[PDB]
Short mmCIF file of C-alpha atoms and ligand atoms in Angstrom, two decimals:
data_model
loop_
_atom_site.label_atom_id
_atom_site.label_comp_id
_atom_site.label_asym_id
_atom_site.label_seq_id
_atom_site.Cartn_x
_atom_site.Cartn_y
_atom_site.Cartn_z
CA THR A 1448 47.84 103.82 -92.60
CA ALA A 1449 49.15 101.62 -95.20
CA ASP A 1450 47.60 98.41 -93.41
CA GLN A 1451 44.11 100.00 -93.33
CA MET A 1452 44.74 101.32 -97.02
CA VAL A 1453 45.27 97.78 -98.17
CA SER A 1454 42.57 96.20 -96.20
CA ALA A 1455 40.04 98.78 -97.60
CA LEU A 1456 41.11 98.08 -101.03
CA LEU A 1457 41.01 94.33 -100.54
CA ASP A 1458 37.55 94.55 -99.14
CA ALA A 1459 36.43 96.99 -101.90
CA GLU A 1460 37.45 94.43 -104.52
CA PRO A 1461 34.58 93.41 -106.98
CA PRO A 1462 33.51 89.90 -107.72
CA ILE A 1463 34.60 87.57 -110.60
CA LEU A 1464 31.50 87.48 -113.04
CA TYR A 1465 30.54 84.70 -115.29
CA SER A 1466 29.63 85.03 -119.13
CA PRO A 1467 28.64 74.90 -127.93
CA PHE A 1468 30.96 78.00 -128.06
CA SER A 1469 30.06 80.31 -131.17
CA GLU A 1470 32.55 82.62 -132.51
CA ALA A 1471 29.95 84.99 -133.76
CA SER A 1472 28.54 85.53 -130.32
CA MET A 1473 32.08 86.38 -128.87
CA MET A 1474 31.53 90.12 -128.96
CA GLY A 1475 28.14 89.81 -127.54
CA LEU A 1476 29.33 87.68 -124.62
CA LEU A 1477 32.35 90.12 -124.15
CA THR A 1478 29.86 93.17 -124.36
CA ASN A 1479 27.38 91.87 -122.03
CA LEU A 1480 30.15 90.70 -119.47
CA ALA A 1481 31.66 94.30 -119.38
CA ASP A 1482 28.41 95.91 -119.24
CA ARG A 1483 27.69 93.97 -115.91
CA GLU A 1484 31.45 94.63 -114.65
CA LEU A 1485 30.70 98.40 -115.00
CA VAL A 1486 28.06 98.33 -112.27
CA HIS A 1487 30.29 96.48 -109.99
CA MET A 1488 33.16 98.79 -110.92
CA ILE A 1489 30.99 101.89 -109.90
CA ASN A 1490 30.52 100.34 -106.48
CA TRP A 1491 34.30 99.46 -106.04
CA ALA A 1492 35.42 103.03 -106.93
CA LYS A 1493 33.13 104.60 -104.40
CA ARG A 1494 35.03 102.57 -101.79
CA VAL A 1495 38.48 103.64 -102.94
CA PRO A 1496 39.59 106.19 -100.17
CA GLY A 1497 39.47 109.56 -100.90
CA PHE A 1498 37.32 109.12 -104.30
CA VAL A 1499 33.85 109.98 -102.83
CA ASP A 1500 35.44 113.20 -101.19
CA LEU A 1501 35.50 114.46 -104.79
CA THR A 1502 32.51 116.03 -106.50
CA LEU A 1503 30.29 113.76 -108.48
CA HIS A 1504 31.23 115.44 -111.55
CA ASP A 1505 35.04 114.90 -111.32
CA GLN A 1506 34.13 111.14 -109.92
CA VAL A 1507 32.47 110.76 -113.43
CA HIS A 1508 35.45 112.21 -115.20
CA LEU A 1509 37.74 110.02 -113.48
CA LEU A 1510 35.72 106.94 -114.21
CA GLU A 1511 35.36 108.23 -118.11
CA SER A 1512 39.07 108.24 -118.46
CA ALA A 1513 39.82 104.96 -116.53
CA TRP A 1514 37.08 102.34 -117.11
CA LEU A 1515 38.63 100.54 -119.87
CA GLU A 1516 41.96 100.61 -118.19
CA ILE A 1517 40.37 99.10 -115.10
CA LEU A 1518 38.41 96.30 -116.86
CA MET A 1519 41.70 95.45 -118.71
CA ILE A 1520 43.94 95.36 -115.65
CA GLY A 1521 41.64 93.17 -113.91
CA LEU A 1522 41.37 91.08 -116.98
CA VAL A 1523 45.27 90.84 -117.10
CA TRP A 1524 45.06 89.89 -113.36
CA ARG A 1525 42.48 87.06 -113.78
CA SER A 1526 44.57 85.76 -116.63
CA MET A 1527 47.91 86.03 -114.60
CA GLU A 1528 48.18 82.31 -113.80
CA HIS A 1529 47.01 80.82 -117.26
CA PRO A 1530 49.83 81.55 -119.66
CA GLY A 1531 48.77 82.37 -123.12
CA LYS A 1532 45.22 82.76 -122.32
CA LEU A 1533 42.93 85.59 -121.27
CA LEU A 1534 40.21 84.60 -118.60
CA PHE A 1535 37.41 87.04 -119.40
CA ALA A 1536 35.27 84.93 -117.12
CA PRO A 1537 35.87 81.59 -115.31
CA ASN A 1538 33.79 80.07 -118.23
CA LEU A 1539 35.15 82.07 -121.00
CA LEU A 1540 38.86 81.42 -121.55
CA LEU A 1541 40.14 82.45 -124.86
CA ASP A 1542 43.42 82.01 -126.73
CA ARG A 1543 44.90 84.27 -129.59
CA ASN A 1544 43.40 82.22 -132.41
CA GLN A 1545 39.80 83.04 -131.16
CA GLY A 1546 40.85 86.76 -131.33
CA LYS A 1547 41.55 86.53 -135.00
CA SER A 1548 37.90 86.72 -135.91
CA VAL A 1549 37.58 90.43 -135.47
CA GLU A 1550 39.71 92.64 -137.19
CA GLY A 1551 42.25 94.53 -134.97
CA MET A 1552 41.37 92.24 -132.10
CA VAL A 1553 44.44 90.08 -131.93
CA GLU A 1554 46.85 93.16 -131.69
CA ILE A 1555 45.16 94.19 -128.38
CA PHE A 1556 44.94 90.50 -127.44
CA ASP A 1557 48.73 90.17 -127.75
CA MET A 1558 49.36 93.30 -125.75
CA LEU A 1559 47.09 91.86 -122.85
CA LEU A 1560 49.03 88.54 -123.12
CA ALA A 1561 52.35 90.37 -122.82
CA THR A 1562 51.10 92.50 -119.54
CA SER A 1563 49.88 89.27 -117.99
CA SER A 1564 53.21 87.59 -118.82
CA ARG A 1565 54.93 90.63 -117.45
CA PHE A 1566 52.87 90.33 -114.19
CA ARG A 1567 53.93 86.75 -114.08
CA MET A 1568 57.72 87.51 -114.37
CA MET A 1569 57.34 90.18 -111.55
CA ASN A 1570 55.23 87.78 -109.25
CA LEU A 1571 52.68 90.56 -108.67
CA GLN A 1572 50.77 90.09 -105.41
CA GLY A 1573 47.11 90.76 -104.87
CA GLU A 1574 47.77 93.63 -102.44
CA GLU A 1575 49.89 95.36 -105.26
CA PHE A 1576 47.33 94.78 -107.68
CA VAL A 1577 44.53 96.52 -105.85
CA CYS A 1578 46.85 99.49 -105.29
CA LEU A 1579 47.91 99.85 -108.99
CA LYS A 1580 44.23 99.57 -109.77
CA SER A 1581 43.41 102.45 -107.53
CA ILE A 1582 46.31 104.36 -109.17
CA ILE A 1583 44.68 103.99 -112.44
CA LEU A 1584 41.37 105.14 -111.13
CA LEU A 1585 42.95 108.35 -109.56
CA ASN A 1586 45.58 109.20 -112.23
CA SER A 1587 44.20 108.51 -115.63
CA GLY A 1588 42.05 111.51 -115.52
CA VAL A 1589 43.64 113.95 -113.16
CA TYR A 1590 45.74 115.58 -116.12
CA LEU A 1591 39.28 126.90 -107.46
CA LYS A 1592 37.61 123.78 -106.89
CA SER A 1593 39.39 121.89 -109.55
CA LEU A 1594 42.67 123.08 -107.38
CA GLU A 1595 41.19 121.59 -104.44
CA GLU A 1596 40.17 118.44 -106.09
CA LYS A 1597 43.56 117.66 -107.77
CA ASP A 1598 45.63 118.43 -104.67
CA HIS A 1599 43.28 115.88 -102.89
CA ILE A 1600 43.67 113.27 -105.54
CA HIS A 1601 47.61 113.67 -105.50
CA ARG A 1602 47.67 113.32 -101.74
CA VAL A 1603 45.79 110.16 -101.87
CA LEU A 1604 48.11 108.94 -104.73
CA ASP A 1605 50.78 109.74 -102.36
CA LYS A 1606 49.32 107.63 -99.75
CA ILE A 1607 49.05 104.60 -102.05
CA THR A 1608 52.65 105.17 -102.96
CA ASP A 1609 53.65 104.87 -99.33
CA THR A 1610 51.36 101.86 -99.13
CA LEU A 1611 53.17 100.06 -102.10
CA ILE A 1612 56.47 100.76 -100.34
CA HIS A 1613 55.24 99.48 -96.98
CA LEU A 1614 54.21 96.21 -98.70
CA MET A 1615 57.52 95.83 -100.35
CA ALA A 1616 59.22 96.56 -96.93
CA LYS A 1617 57.15 93.97 -95.29
CA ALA A 1618 58.20 91.50 -97.82
CA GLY A 1619 61.74 91.69 -96.82
CA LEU A 1620 62.97 93.88 -99.86
CA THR A 1621 65.89 96.10 -99.67
CA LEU A 1622 65.44 99.86 -99.95
CA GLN A 1623 66.90 99.89 -103.53
CA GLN A 1624 64.79 96.99 -104.46
CA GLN A 1625 61.84 98.80 -103.28
CA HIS A 1626 62.34 101.83 -105.33
CA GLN A 1627 63.23 99.44 -108.48
CA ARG A 1628 59.90 97.51 -107.96
CA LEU A 1629 57.87 100.51 -107.41
CA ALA A 1630 59.19 101.96 -110.51
CA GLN A 1631 58.50 98.66 -112.62
CA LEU A 1632 54.88 98.75 -111.41
CA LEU A 1633 54.31 102.24 -112.30
CA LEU A 1634 55.91 101.72 -115.74
CA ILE A 1635 53.40 98.96 -116.65
CA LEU A 1636 50.51 101.60 -116.00
CA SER A 1637 52.05 103.33 -119.16
CA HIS A 1638 51.51 100.27 -121.30
CA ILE A 1639 47.90 99.83 -119.80
CA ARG A 1640 47.04 103.28 -120.91
CA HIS A 1641 48.54 102.42 -124.19
CA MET A 1642 46.27 99.22 -124.47
CA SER A 1643 43.20 101.16 -123.28
CA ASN A 1644 43.71 103.78 -126.15
CA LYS A 1645 44.13 101.06 -128.66
CA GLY A 1646 41.10 99.35 -127.27
CA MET A 1647 39.16 102.67 -127.33
CA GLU A 1648 39.85 103.10 -131.10
CA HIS A 1649 38.96 99.32 -131.64
CA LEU A 1650 35.46 99.91 -129.91
CA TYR A 1651 34.75 102.98 -132.07
CA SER A 1652 35.34 100.93 -135.40
CA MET A 1653 32.24 98.84 -134.88
CA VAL A 1654 30.19 101.89 -127.10
CA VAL A 1655 31.60 104.19 -124.23
CA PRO A 1656 29.40 104.80 -121.10
CA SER A 1657 28.20 108.42 -121.39
CA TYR A 1658 28.66 111.14 -118.86
CA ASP A 1659 24.70 110.94 -118.38
CA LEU A 1660 25.12 107.25 -117.80
CA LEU A 1661 27.98 107.23 -115.45
CA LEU A 1662 26.42 109.97 -113.43
CA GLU A 1663 23.39 107.96 -113.00
CA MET A 1664 25.28 105.11 -111.77
CA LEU A 1665 27.70 107.15 -109.43
CA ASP A 1666 24.77 109.51 -108.07
CA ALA A 1667 22.78 107.33 -105.44
CA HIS A 1668 19.80 108.12 -103.20
CA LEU B 279 79.17 96.78 -119.73
CA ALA B 280 77.39 100.10 -119.42
CA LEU B 281 75.58 98.92 -116.31
CA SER B 282 78.68 99.98 -114.35
CA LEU B 283 78.19 103.68 -114.31
CA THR B 284 77.61 105.34 -111.16
CA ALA B 285 74.42 107.35 -110.43
CA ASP B 286 76.45 110.50 -110.95
CA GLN B 287 78.00 109.27 -114.06
CA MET B 288 74.82 108.29 -115.57
CA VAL B 289 73.40 111.75 -114.77
CA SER B 290 76.36 113.32 -116.73
CA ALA B 291 76.16 110.98 -119.79
CA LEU B 292 72.53 111.96 -120.11
CA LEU B 293 73.21 115.72 -119.50
CA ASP B 294 76.02 115.57 -122.24
CA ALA B 295 73.58 113.77 -124.74
CA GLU B 296 71.00 116.29 -124.76
CA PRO B 297 70.19 117.35 -128.33
CA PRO B 298 70.30 121.01 -129.29
CA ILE B 299 67.11 123.26 -129.64
CA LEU B 300 66.13 123.47 -133.24
CA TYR B 301 64.39 126.71 -135.02
CA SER B 302 61.51 126.90 -137.24
CA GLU B 303 61.94 127.22 -141.00
CA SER B 304 51.09 126.86 -142.88
CA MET B 305 51.51 126.70 -139.11
CA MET B 306 51.44 122.93 -139.52
CA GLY B 307 54.20 122.55 -142.24
CA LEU B 308 56.48 124.20 -139.87
CA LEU B 309 55.57 121.66 -137.09
CA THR B 310 56.09 118.79 -139.40
CA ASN B 311 59.33 120.26 -140.83
CA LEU B 312 60.41 120.83 -137.16
CA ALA B 313 59.54 117.30 -135.93
CA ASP B 314 61.24 115.88 -139.16
CA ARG B 315 64.65 117.66 -138.36
CA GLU B 316 64.38 116.87 -134.59
CA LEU B 317 64.16 113.15 -135.22
CA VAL B 318 67.61 112.93 -136.50
CA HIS B 319 69.07 114.46 -133.45
CA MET B 320 66.70 112.14 -131.41
CA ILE B 321 68.61 109.06 -132.90
CA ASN B 322 72.05 110.55 -131.93
CA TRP B 323 70.74 111.10 -128.30
CA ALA B 324 69.27 107.69 -128.07
CA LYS B 325 72.79 106.37 -129.12
CA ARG B 326 74.15 108.10 -125.99
CA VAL B 327 71.74 106.68 -123.69
CA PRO B 328 73.90 104.23 -121.62
CA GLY B 329 72.98 100.61 -122.66
CA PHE B 330 71.11 101.58 -125.70
CA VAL B 331 73.56 100.70 -128.23
CA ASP B 332 74.17 97.48 -126.39
CA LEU B 333 70.86 96.32 -128.06
CA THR B 334 70.54 94.89 -131.76
CA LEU B 335 69.73 97.35 -134.46
CA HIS B 336 66.36 95.66 -134.91
CA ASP B 337 65.39 96.22 -131.19
CA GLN B 338 66.89 99.78 -131.26
CA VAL B 339 64.56 100.67 -134.05
CA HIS B 340 61.46 99.30 -132.38
CA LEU B 341 62.10 101.24 -129.08
CA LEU B 342 62.34 104.37 -131.39
CA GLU B 343 59.22 103.52 -133.23
CA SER B 344 57.39 103.37 -130.03
CA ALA B 345 58.95 106.42 -128.18
CA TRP B 346 59.73 109.10 -130.86
CA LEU B 347 56.54 110.91 -130.51
CA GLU B 348 56.64 110.72 -126.64
CA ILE B 349 60.21 112.17 -126.62
CA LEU B 350 59.23 115.06 -128.98
CA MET B 351 56.47 115.67 -126.60
CA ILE B 352 58.21 115.76 -123.19
CA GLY B 353 60.97 117.84 -124.83
CA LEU B 354 58.21 120.22 -126.06
CA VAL B 355 56.68 120.19 -122.44
CA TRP B 356 60.05 120.83 -120.91
CA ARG B 357 60.71 123.82 -123.07
CA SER B 358 57.29 125.29 -122.73
CA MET B 359 57.52 124.93 -118.77
CA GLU B 360 58.67 128.60 -118.27
CA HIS B 361 55.93 129.87 -120.45
CA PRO B 362 52.44 129.45 -118.99
CA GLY B 363 49.55 129.17 -121.23
CA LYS B 364 51.92 128.50 -124.45
CA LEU B 365 54.04 126.06 -126.12
CA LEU B 366 57.46 126.70 -127.11
CA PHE B 367 58.01 124.48 -130.12
CA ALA B 368 60.91 126.50 -131.01
CA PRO B 369 62.46 129.93 -129.94
CA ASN B 370 60.73 131.40 -132.79
CA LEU B 371 57.60 129.43 -132.71
CA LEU B 372 55.86 130.23 -129.49
CA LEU B 373 52.01 129.29 -129.92
CA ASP B 374 49.08 129.87 -127.67
CA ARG B 375 46.03 127.83 -127.11
CA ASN B 376 44.00 129.91 -129.53
CA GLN B 377 46.43 129.25 -132.34
CA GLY B 378 45.12 125.65 -132.05
CA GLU B 379 39.92 120.03 -135.71
CA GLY B 380 41.37 117.95 -132.83
CA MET B 381 44.50 119.99 -132.22
CA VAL B 382 43.29 122.12 -129.27
CA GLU B 383 42.59 118.76 -127.26
CA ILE B 384 46.21 117.74 -127.40
CA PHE B 385 47.45 121.15 -127.07
CA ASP B 386 45.51 121.61 -123.78
CA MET B 387 47.03 118.14 -122.65
CA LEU B 388 50.49 119.31 -123.38
CA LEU B 389 49.81 122.62 -121.44
CA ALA B 390 48.42 120.78 -118.52
CA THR B 391 51.66 118.55 -118.54
CA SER B 392 54.01 121.54 -118.77
CA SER B 393 51.99 123.20 -115.82
CA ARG B 394 52.28 119.92 -114.12
CA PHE B 395 56.10 119.98 -114.59
CA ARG B 396 56.18 123.78 -113.28
CA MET B 397 54.40 123.24 -109.87
CA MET B 398 56.68 120.04 -109.27
CA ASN B 399 59.85 122.21 -109.98
CA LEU B 400 60.96 119.39 -112.38
CA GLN B 401 64.85 119.46 -112.63
CA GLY B 402 67.06 119.23 -115.62
CA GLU B 403 68.79 116.09 -114.46
CA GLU B 404 65.56 114.62 -113.59
CA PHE B 405 64.07 115.49 -116.86
CA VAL B 406 66.98 113.77 -118.81
CA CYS B 407 66.26 110.89 -116.76
CA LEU B 408 62.57 110.68 -117.76
CA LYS B 409 63.41 110.98 -121.28
CA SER B 410 65.58 107.86 -121.06
CA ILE B 411 62.79 105.87 -119.37
CA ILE B 412 60.56 106.74 -122.16
CA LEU B 413 62.93 105.37 -124.83
CA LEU B 414 63.82 102.10 -122.96
CA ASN B 415 60.13 101.51 -121.66
CA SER B 416 57.72 102.54 -124.37
CA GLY B 417 58.53 99.41 -126.61
CA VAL B 418 59.73 96.82 -124.16
CA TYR B 419 56.27 95.04 -123.96
CA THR B 420 55.49 94.76 -127.72
CA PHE B 421 58.66 93.03 -128.78
CA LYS B 422 67.82 86.59 -126.97
CA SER B 423 64.60 88.45 -127.17
CA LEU B 424 64.37 87.62 -123.22
CA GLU B 425 68.04 88.72 -122.99
CA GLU B 426 67.46 92.00 -124.46
CA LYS B 427 64.39 92.81 -122.37
CA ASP B 428 66.33 91.71 -119.34
CA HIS B 429 69.03 94.12 -120.35
CA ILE B 430 66.39 97.00 -120.90
CA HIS B 431 65.01 96.21 -117.34
CA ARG B 432 68.46 96.43 -115.84
CA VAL B 433 69.22 99.83 -117.49
CA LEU B 434 65.65 100.96 -116.57
CA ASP B 435 66.48 99.92 -112.81
CA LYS B 436 69.83 101.90 -113.14
CA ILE B 437 67.83 105.03 -114.02
CA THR B 438 65.53 104.53 -111.07
CA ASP B 439 68.56 104.45 -108.69
CA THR B 440 69.85 107.48 -110.66
CA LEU B 441 66.65 109.45 -110.01
CA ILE B 442 66.42 108.45 -106.42
CA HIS B 443 70.13 109.45 -105.98
CA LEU B 444 69.38 112.89 -107.36
CA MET B 445 66.35 113.44 -104.95
CA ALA B 446 68.41 112.02 -102.04
CA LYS B 447 71.23 114.53 -102.88
CA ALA B 448 68.54 117.22 -102.94
CA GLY B 449 67.65 116.70 -99.28
CA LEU B 450 64.38 114.90 -99.61
CA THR B 451 63.22 112.42 -97.06
CA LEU B 452 62.97 108.65 -98.10
CA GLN B 453 59.10 109.01 -98.04
CA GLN B 454 59.40 112.16 -100.22
CA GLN B 455 61.67 110.24 -102.67
CA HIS B 456 59.28 107.36 -103.18
CA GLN B 457 56.41 110.03 -103.51
CA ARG B 458 58.45 112.04 -106.10
CA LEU B 459 59.45 109.10 -107.93
CA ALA B 460 55.77 107.84 -108.23
CA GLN B 461 54.64 111.43 -109.30
CA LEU B 462 57.21 111.59 -112.07
CA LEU B 463 56.58 108.02 -113.53
CA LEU B 464 52.70 108.63 -113.31
CA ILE B 465 53.07 111.68 -115.80
CA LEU B 466 54.83 109.32 -118.20
CA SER B 467 51.47 107.48 -118.39
CA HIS B 468 49.76 110.69 -119.55
CA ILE B 469 52.46 111.57 -122.13
CA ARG B 470 51.69 108.13 -123.52
CA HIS B 471 48.29 109.09 -123.64
CA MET B 472 48.99 112.33 -125.43
CA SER B 473 51.23 110.54 -128.10
CA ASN B 474 48.44 107.87 -128.66
CA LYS B 475 45.99 110.80 -129.34
CA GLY B 476 48.60 112.78 -131.21
CA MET B 477 49.20 109.66 -133.49
CA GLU B 478 45.45 109.47 -134.11
CA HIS B 479 45.14 113.17 -134.67
CA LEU B 480 48.11 113.22 -137.14
CA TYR B 481 46.38 110.15 -138.78
CA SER B 482 43.43 112.33 -139.30
CA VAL B 483 55.35 107.73 -138.67
CA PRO B 484 59.11 107.20 -139.57
CA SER B 485 59.58 103.98 -141.45
CA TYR B 486 61.73 100.92 -140.04
CA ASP B 487 64.08 101.75 -142.89
CA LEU B 488 64.66 105.32 -142.27
CA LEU B 489 65.16 104.90 -138.47
CA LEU B 490 67.91 102.13 -139.31
CA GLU B 491 69.68 104.36 -141.74
CA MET B 492 69.77 107.43 -139.02
CA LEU B 493 71.19 104.70 -136.80
O1 TT5 C 383 36.56 91.96 -125.75
C1 TT5 C 383 37.34 92.57 -125.55
C2 TT5 C 383 38.79 92.65 -126.39
C3 TT5 C 383 39.78 91.69 -125.99
C4 TT5 C 383 40.96 91.85 -126.78
C5 TT5 C 383 41.08 92.47 -127.90
C6 TT5 C 383 40.07 93.50 -128.27
C7 TT5 C 383 38.81 93.43 -127.72
N1 TT5 C 383 37.35 93.32 -124.37
C8 TT5 C 383 36.16 93.27 -123.44
C9 TT5 C 383 35.24 94.43 -123.76
C10 TT5 C 383 34.15 94.47 -124.53
C11 TT5 C 383 33.21 95.75 -124.79
C12 TT5 C 383 33.33 96.73 -124.06
O2 TT5 C 383 32.50 97.99 -124.22
C13 TT5 C 383 31.09 97.65 -124.24
C14 TT5 C 383 30.47 99.01 -124.59
N2 TT5 C 383 30.03 99.63 -123.41
C15 TT5 C 383 28.63 99.91 -123.49
C16 TT5 C 383 28.05 100.14 -122.04
C17 TT5 C 383 29.01 100.98 -121.37
C18 TT5 C 383 30.05 99.97 -120.86
C19 TT5 C 383 30.48 99.02 -122.06
C20 TT5 C 383 34.64 96.91 -122.94
C21 TT5 C 383 35.27 95.69 -122.76
C22 TT5 C 383 36.40 93.16 -121.92
C23 TT5 C 383 35.03 92.30 -121.30
C24 TT5 C 383 35.15 92.14 -120.07
C25 TT5 C 383 36.59 92.31 -119.24
O3 TT5 C 383 36.76 92.22 -118.01
C26 TT5 C 383 37.48 93.09 -119.95
C27 TT5 C 383 37.48 93.26 -121.41
C28 TT5 C 383 38.68 93.99 -122.20
C29 TT5 C 383 38.39 94.33 -123.62
C30 TT5 C 383 38.81 95.77 -124.01
C31 TT5 C 383 39.98 94.60 -124.08
O1 TT5 C 384 52.29 119.95 -133.98
C1 TT5 C 384 52.23 119.33 -133.00
C2 TT5 C 384 50.84 119.33 -132.21
C3 TT5 C 384 51.00 120.13 -131.15
C4 TT5 C 384 49.80 120.53 -130.43
C5 TT5 C 384 48.59 119.84 -130.84
C6 TT5 C 384 48.38 119.01 -131.92
C7 TT5 C 384 49.56 118.80 -132.67
N1 TT5 C 384 53.36 118.42 -132.75
C8 TT5 C 384 54.46 118.54 -133.67
C9 TT5 C 384 54.42 117.36 -134.56
C10 TT5 C 384 54.19 117.42 -135.81
C11 TT5 C 384 54.29 116.23 -136.93
C12 TT5 C 384 54.64 115.26 -136.48
O2 TT5 C 384 54.82 114.13 -137.28
C13 TT5 C 384 55.24 114.72 -138.51
C14 TT5 C 384 55.31 113.41 -139.52
N2 TT5 C 384 56.56 112.92 -139.48
C15 TT5 C 384 56.98 112.68 -138.39
C16 TT5 C 384 58.13 111.62 -138.06
C17 TT5 C 384 58.82 111.14 -139.43
C18 TT5 C 384 57.94 111.38 -140.82
C19 TT5 C 384 56.57 111.80 -140.09
C20 TT5 C 384 54.95 114.94 -134.82
C21 TT5 C 384 54.86 116.00 -134.15
C22 TT5 C 384 55.74 118.67 -132.87
C23 TT5 C 384 57.05 119.24 -133.45
C24 TT5 C 384 57.88 119.40 -132.69
C25 TT5 C 384 57.96 119.20 -131.18
O3 TT5 C 384 58.97 119.23 -130.43
C26 TT5 C 384 56.95 118.69 -130.63
C27 TT5 C 384 55.58 118.52 -131.55
C28 TT5 C 384 54.37 117.97 -130.60
C29 TT5 C 384 53.36 117.59 -131.62
C30 TT5 C 384 52.75 116.08 -131.35
C31 TT5 C 384 52.15 117.35 -130.60
#
């Protein structure tokens, strides 16, 4: 049910990781941190309900599409209550002037600040965050076995929608406010997809976990 | 002022605002020429979206800069819906996957979005609602300024109520309503992905002044 869905997602949540400050080592610090987050992200995805029911190959493809989005929404969430700053790590808090070093970095940095500000204006809750995060993992790459795979992903996404509505109903929101907030939340995902693509372009101008690399982390013994 | 229309009145204003289907006049000169001609009718459609002209001209242009490729794509996806395996760019330009460097990637994504619309039985009054959400939402995060974004979010909220009212009219349960709403808005995230990849593939853009003058 929605309550067991929330609890599983709240319990599957990964930990917050840590990184004279040097501007030149910034991209080094940020790369090392994201490489370590990827490991815990693999563990988190395996505990999202319905994810491991999928074949190993579609699990990789799903993670291949969403990994940057997921890193970004977690960054936006960690930065939600520090206006104007991104909290990459508790010991790595940056403002937009520190992003001016790399070319094309401050544009993505401003889009992440607008999203964190948008979460603030919405007063996003942690139970809603883990729901959106899980939706990113299942929806970003979903567009005979593949018919069965896709129908299962959409059934799980259906359960998460009902979970979102249930948290909104438990919060006392009206039925009209429930539809409106759900729409407001899922519309932010289009912008997160947008940032991930701009960030993907920015990473190639200097990088992506390979299929063979993601499969090793997913395929356990 | 425009936030006073009923859900039925909102549907009718969007249905009456739909642009015409244009015709094609080297396969890529025709796609560019087609897209340039569709852009003018898109501006006139955007002006008839309830609440759009209530924004300043500066913010109207910014919304159109962000959403124009998405709106052309969802319109193409809508036209190709009844044509499996092919995209209907124009009634005299019906292309297949084999007619498509970097083009078959985007072509496949459009074909998959069209097929997703088909098995969802996307309706016309639902489609016109999804197109107005793209126009208002695609640029609201990259902008008095706060009054404008409050207005955009108010109108976006009315379309949500409009979409839910259409699903309720059709006999869907409340649970089926939330699930269909979520399903449709999750496809917008993919259209945005195609527009991004399309923009990179085109780079491999209408100016502010041009959009302003067509307005
Ligand atoms: O610096 C930036 C940034 C911020 C603002 C504007 C432009 C860029 N980023 C950081 C990052 C760094 C490298 C990386 O790719 C590394 C290669 N690759 C090699 C092995 C496989 C996986 C990684 C991905 C993300 C990072 C770190 C932690 C975090 O929580 C989130 C992010 C987000 C982000 C994308 C926005
Ligand atoms: O060909 C393609 C295509 C299709 C499949 C795979 C790859 C590419 N496209 C066509 C197009 C062409 C040029 C253009 O940009 C032209 C510059 N021009 C643009 C504004 C003003 C000045 C610059 C935009 C869109 C087009 C036409 C009509 C339509 O309904 C939809 C589309 C869709 C689309 C993006 C997918």
